[PDB]
Amino acid sequence: SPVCLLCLQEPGDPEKLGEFLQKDNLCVHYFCLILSSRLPQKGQPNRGLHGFMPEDIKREAVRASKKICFVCKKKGAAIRCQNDQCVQNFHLPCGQERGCLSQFFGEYKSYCRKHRP
Ligand SMILES: [Zn+2]
Ligand SMILES: [Zn+2]
Ligand SMILES: [Zn+2]
């Protein structure tokens, strides 16, 4: 049963996590890609996964493997609350159960519930 490399969950609800993408030997939710806090987009649009290069995605999985999700208490949390004085990290699906807010513009920031702008 395939899982997203960034949140470690199954395809789930595409309205909440985006389409489940499979390319370059990787599986990832589209929103996990665009909301991942420190993921560079260094490719042209027809490269990698919409310009997100497989190497960078994997490096982002590695960075996140050292971060604990405040919701489920497991490693692999790739999203960080973007309030400057907050250290909460979370998997996207987990954050969505606890009122975390994601923005789909600009730096594509997310916030924990206490820091919703
Ligand atoms: Zn995901
Ligand atoms: Zn989690
Ligand atoms: Zn916060």
| Biggest β-sheet description | 2 strands, antiparallel
The appropriate CATH architecture is 2-Layer Sandwich
Quaternary organisation of the protein chains: monomer
Structural class computed from helices and strand pairing: alpha+beta
How far apart are the first and last residues' alpha carbons, in Å? 37 Å
Shape field:
globular
Tell me the CATH superfamily.
Answer: Zinc/RING finger domain, C3HC4 (zinc finger)
Give me the Rg, rounded.
13 Å
**Small molecules held by this entry:** zinc ion
- How many separate helices? 4
Query: How helix-rich are the residues, as a percent range?
Result: 10-25%
Tally of structural domains: 1
Order of helices and strands: HEEHHEEHEE
CATH topology: Herpes Virus-1
CATH class: Alpha Beta
Proportion of residues in extended strands: 5-15%
How many strand units?
A: 6
Going across the biggest sheet, name each strand in turn: 1-2
Protein architecture, described:
The chain has 117 residues and is an alpha+beta fold. The chain has one domain (14-115): 2-Layer Sandwich (Herpes Virus-1). It is 23% helix and 14% strand. A two-stranded antiparallel sheet has the order 1-2. A two-stranded antiparallel ribbon has the order 3-4. Strands 5-6 form a two-stranded antiparallel ribbon. Strand 1 (20-23) and strand 2 (26-29) form a beta hairpin. The longest helix is centred in the middle third of the chain and has 11 residues, at 54-64. Bound molecules: zinc ion (ZN) (3 copies). One zinc ion (ZN) is lined by residues 69, 71-72, 74, 90-91, 94. It is classed as ligase. Keywords: Ubiquitin, ligase.
